[PDB]
Amino acid sequence: ALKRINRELADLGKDPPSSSSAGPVGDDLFHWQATIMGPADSPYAGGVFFLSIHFPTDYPFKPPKVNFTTRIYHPNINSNGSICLDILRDQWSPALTISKVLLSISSLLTDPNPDDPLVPEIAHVYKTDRSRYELSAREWTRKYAIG
């Protein structure tokens, strides 16, 4: 529990994630506030997205609760910030680090999966009218993820 959380925190500290920066809130180990930088080769370029990570008391035997805070226009992310990640609901195993979760979220941001969407309207726009999806994503990442 606490020892595993601190091991992951130190591993993040020892090796800089470059594209991410996770740390405890205040002095509580069961509530982290991570930061993700928008991938360069994506509509979210030049954006900073804040994530809230809530470790369950049974960590790592139960998945952490990762929720977006900055608004994002993505097919697999809804307005509450819930992320459609298979490794967070039922595929979780006590062998995944927070760095792996952040890398998975960054990869998801790199390319969405509209075949199994979480926001059907955004997925429909992505599949049919790609240019309008690009414009909407740029507008959202310029209005919310900047400043």
Binding site: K62, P117, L118, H124
Partner: protein
């Protein structure tokens, strides 16, 4: 006509048909001693048609060793006559009678016959009749730490279900022409060779949709084969396969035939040569009793042991048994012939009651046929066990003194135990402790804690509670009942109503835990189990964990400095479906039930909470606007539930329910089909609505349909309850109101600055001020599965079935909906009895203070298949710290309340370790990577002051220690684990 309010948990194990067939069966029980009374109690709680008792022998004192329906005022009265009255109260649907005399013909009046405490000649005489007339015959025996069970259900027993598992079902990706059926991605069918399956909804091969079962030839974890489907088609796409279970014919043998050539059931594979020894030993016991006017060998008597061994040799020679007799084991059976232990009685009674239920219901695979069990590892070795100590003292504990002696009785009578929970296992544990005389001495004591109250459904497996006690505290009732059973426990039992958790450390503190001898868990959740395990680890107290699940059960023992704790092992967690599956694309009824539960919470619980918090907290809106994920959603909920959609009568509630029906079952599906039409394709060209995704279809409100009306009634009633109106159930008003409804038009929308904050403020100021509404509160709906008059399960069932109709999923009834939504754990009385027996057999090892780890046995069993297994506990892991052997679990550092700097210096100088992280509770007290200013501010403070400052909460006066988790590195920088720190305040 089964009373589902009482058999709620048992029906999830047996079923409606099994119980219907069970409630028409008669059971006769011969022998009303501890084993007989245990069997009768379990059968009465199960719910058979009636029970008849036959035991005309007058009561004696030693019979109180395991008979809990006998008192010292009943000495000299036949046991059946004084037990029938107390047995008749357990269940009101199961009459209990007594027969003064037994005749052979009379045996035809019964469906099952259980025989205990009977000679072998009488057993043969009974079985010779009950075998040729097709009557189930069970014979049970308990001698000291040994037990025997024999089952004979006839030569043509029909077993419909052989394992108790639900039929295996799965989804198919493709079926080739060679019969090769393939599952979907990363899906294991779980089938085995010889199983039967039937296919449905198969596209391209209609022939397989008939439903005829077909053989299974497993070829891999993901694919199997069914044979040749050449004629039916060339290739099949998609579909669902479901296993078919066929009846099995089991042929038994009579007792006379099976004495010569028995068929053993092995409860343990480490000792496979013993059952052949016990087979001779019990027959020799019967012969010795018949040769001495029914007198068993005296306890720990050498002459009787020699004579009994001579009888064993004679029997082994006569029956041509080519087995070498083990003299030590046989003479041990001789010594404990007069023993009567309540733990062995409980274990065997649970097993025999399960066998009776198998005989009546023709379900589960029975024992076939002999089952010989022993717990000889429980015999004490730290006390004197001889003829002098084991002779009877003329007290109610003679049956236990004959096995353990008087010194061990004095050891038991001074125990100071702590029982967590007072459920079914708690009641059984308290009964066993009362019978064993636990804490009946001067220095003994028992403490039982449980915060729950007695409900109707708890009376099925908790026999210490009566219908007149419904609504009272469990702990007080249990303590009173066990004080009634054993009068010596008057004033030796303390009952609390406290939940064992972090908030109860002021009651279960250092003083409370420093006087205990052992802790027994009777809980049902993992959080409390882990907490109690941590407390026991810190205080170094033995712990006894036990759990049941339907017909399965397990028991584990935690011994300080010997074995690992409860938290060192991991169990399969609960399954939570992906959010995208539940939200848009379900394919099973569980998804729809989960969605319905979320809908219930979001409609009748969350908005009411927001409204109530808005009217109470003066600064709620400002906090929500910058803290809540969707402040707009909160404002919309408050507005809608306060001003926009506040009902004034029940008609408006009905209108709102109709509107919500349209919102959730007609409009969202239209939007989804507008976004993803039924003919759309994925990026790879495959059709979108194929495989795990099922195309939905909107529902048009038809009032005459039962499901729509049920949803309307439930939703309207719950809304009225939220707003405190008068609900109604007459269909006339519903049909009158709903006729005059004009559906608002709906057309799906294709989509295509900082004014949003202005709109939010406009919505906020439109709400009435909190001052204008003083004392106005809305009642939230707290989910309650056990009450059938609150429309909770009805609403969930209606919503789930309507969503299933949307996606053409098979709807489920209210029974399965209550099972799934309520997270009901199936439970049985027999499993509880068995686990209590095993735990009480381990308790006598704990009392004796056995040191070797091979002398303790964790136990697992499954009564659906008659499986019992026992394995040694896993030893606690060791480690090397500074060239010393440290136990990982049971070792700690004891330190004063020194400053942080002094603690770091102590760890650097003594252990030669560099501290890099130090935490207490859920707070990070010290980390190596913190800015130097923070450390310079924190270093010169004491640990107690540091914790008070970081946690912003003063330490409670009853606090006497702190548990610190420390991670440190060695000199070279390699991480080394160290035990936790116990700072003494």
């Amino acid at each position: 006509t089964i009373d589902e309010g009482l058999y709620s948990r048992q029906l999830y194990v047996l079923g409606h048909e099994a119980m219907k067939q069970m409630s028409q069966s008669n059971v006769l029980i011969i022998g009303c001693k501890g084993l007989g009374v245990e069997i009768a109690k379990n059968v009465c709680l199960a719910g058979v048609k009636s029970v008849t008792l036959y035991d005309p022998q007058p009561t004696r004192i030693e019979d109180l060793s395991s008979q809990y329906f006998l008192t010292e005022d009943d000495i000299g009265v036949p046991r059946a006559k004084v037990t029938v009255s107390k047995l008749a109260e357990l269940n009101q649907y199961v009459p209990v009678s007594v027969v003064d005399e037994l005749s052979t013909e009379y045996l035809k009046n019964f469906k099952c016959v259980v025989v205990t405490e009977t000679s072998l000649t009488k057993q043969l005489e009974i079985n010779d009749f009950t075998h040729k007339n097709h009557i189930a015959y069970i014979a049970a025996d308990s001698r000291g730490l040994f037990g025997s069970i024999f089952c004979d259900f006839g030569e043509n027993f029909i077993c419909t279900d052989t394992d108790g598992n639900e039929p295996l079902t799965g989804m198919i990706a493709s079926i080739t022409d060679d019969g090769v059926v393939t599952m979907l991605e990363e899906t294991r069918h779980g089938l085995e060779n010889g199983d039967f399956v039937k296919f449905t909804e198969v596209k391209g091969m209609p022939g397989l949709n008939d439903g005829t079962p077909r053989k299974v030839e497993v070829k891999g974890p993901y694919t199997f084969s069914i044979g040749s489907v050449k004629d039916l088609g060339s290739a099949g796409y998609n579909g669902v396969f479901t296993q078919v279970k066929v009846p099995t014919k089991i042929s038994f043998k009579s007792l006379r035939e099976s004495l010569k050539d028995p068929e053993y059931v092995y409860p343990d594979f480490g000792k496979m040569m013993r059952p052949p020894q016990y087979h001779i030993a019990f027959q020799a016991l019967s012969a010795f009793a018949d040769a001495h006017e029914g007198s068993l060998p005296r306890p720990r008597n050498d002459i009787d042991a020699a004579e009994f061994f001579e009888f064993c040799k004679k029997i082994a020679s006569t029956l041509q048994f080519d087995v070498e007799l083990d003299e030590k084991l046989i003479k041990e059976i001789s010594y404990q012939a007069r023993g009567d232990l309540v733990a062995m009685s409980a274990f065997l009674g649970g097993a025999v009651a399960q066998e009776v239920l198998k005989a009546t219901t023709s379900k589960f695979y029975p024992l076939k046929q002999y089952f010989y069990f022993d717990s000889l590892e429980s015999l004490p070795s730290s006390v004197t066990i001889s003829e002098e100590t084991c002779k009877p003292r003329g007290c109610r504990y003679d049956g236990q003194i004959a096995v353990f002696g008087s010194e061990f009785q004095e050891k038991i009578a001074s125990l100071s135990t702590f029982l967590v929970g007072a459920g079914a296992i708690g009641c059984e544990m308290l009964k066993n402790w009362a019978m064993m005389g636990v804490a009946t001495g001067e220095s003994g004591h028992i403490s039982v804690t449980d915060m729950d109250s007695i409900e109707k459904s708890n009376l099925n497996r908790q026999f210490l509670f009566r219908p007149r006690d419904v609504g009272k505290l469990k702990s007080e009732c249990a303590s009173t009942a066990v004080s009634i059973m054993n009068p010596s426990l008057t004033g030796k039992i303390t009952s609390y109503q406290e939940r064992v958790g972090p908030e109860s450390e002021g009651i279960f503190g250092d003083e409370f835990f420093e006087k205990l001898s052992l802790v027994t868990n009777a809980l049902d959740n993992v959080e409390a189990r882990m907490y109690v395990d941590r407390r026991c680890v810190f205080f170094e107290k033995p712990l006894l964990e036990s759990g049941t699940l339907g017909t399965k059960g397990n028991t584990q023992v935690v011994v300080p400095h010997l074995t690992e704790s409860y938290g060192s092992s991991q169990d399969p967690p609960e399954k939570s479906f992906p959010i995208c599956t539940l939200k848009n694309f379900p394919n099973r009824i569980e998804h729809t039930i989960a969605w319905a539960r979320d809908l219930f919470e979001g409609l009748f619980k969350q908005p009411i909470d927001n409204v109530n918090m808005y009217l109470s907290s003066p600064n709620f809106l400002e906090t929500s606007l910058k803290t809540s994920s969707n402040p707009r959603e909160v404002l919309e909920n408050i507005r809608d539930y306060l001003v926009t959609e506040k009902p004034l009568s029940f008609e408006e509630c009905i209108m709102w329910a109709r509107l919500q029906f349209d919102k959730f079952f007609n409009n969202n599906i239209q939007q989804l089909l507008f976004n993803f039409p039924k003919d759309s394709v994925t990026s790879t060209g495959q059709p979108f609505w194929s495989g795990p995704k099922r195309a939905p279809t909107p529902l048009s409100f038809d009032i005459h349909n039962r499901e729509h009306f049920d949803f309307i009634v439930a939703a309207a009633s719950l809304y009225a309850f939220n707003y405190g109106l008068k609900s109604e159930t007459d269909p006339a008003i519903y049909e009158r109101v709903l006729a005059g409804y004009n559906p608002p038009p709906f057309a799906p929308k294709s989509g295509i600055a900082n004014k949003d904050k202005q709109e939010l403020k406009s919505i906020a100021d439109s709400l009435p001020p909190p001052s204008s509404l003083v004392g106005f509160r809305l009642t939230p709906a707290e989910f309650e599965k056990d009450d059938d008059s609150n429309h909770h399960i009805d609403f969930i069932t209606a919503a789930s079935n309507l969503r299933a109709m949307n996606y053409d999923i098979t709807p489920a009834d209210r029974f399965k909906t209550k099972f799934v939504a309520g997270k009901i754990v199936p439970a049985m009385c027999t499993s509880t009895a068995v686990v209590s027996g095993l735990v009480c057999l381990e308790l006598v090892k704990l009392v004796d203070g056995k040191k070797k780890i091979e002398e303790y046995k964790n136990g697992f069993f499954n009564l659906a298949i008659g499986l019992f297994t026992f394995s040694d506990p896993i030893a606690s892991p060791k480690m090397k710290v500074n060239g010393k052997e440290i136990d990982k679990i049971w070792d700690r550092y004891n330190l004063p309340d020194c400053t942080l700097q002094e603690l770091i210096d102590y760890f650097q100088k003594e252990e030669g370790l560099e501290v890099t992280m130090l935490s207490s509770g859920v707070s990070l007290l010290y980390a190596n990577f913190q800015p130097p200013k923070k450390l310079a501010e924190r270093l010169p403070l004491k640990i107690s002051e540091l914790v008070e400052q970081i946690t912003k909460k003063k330490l409670e006066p009853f606090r006497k220690h702190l548990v610190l988790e420390i991670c440190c590195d060695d000199a070279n920088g390699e991480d080394v684990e160290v035990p936790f720190i116990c700072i003494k305040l």
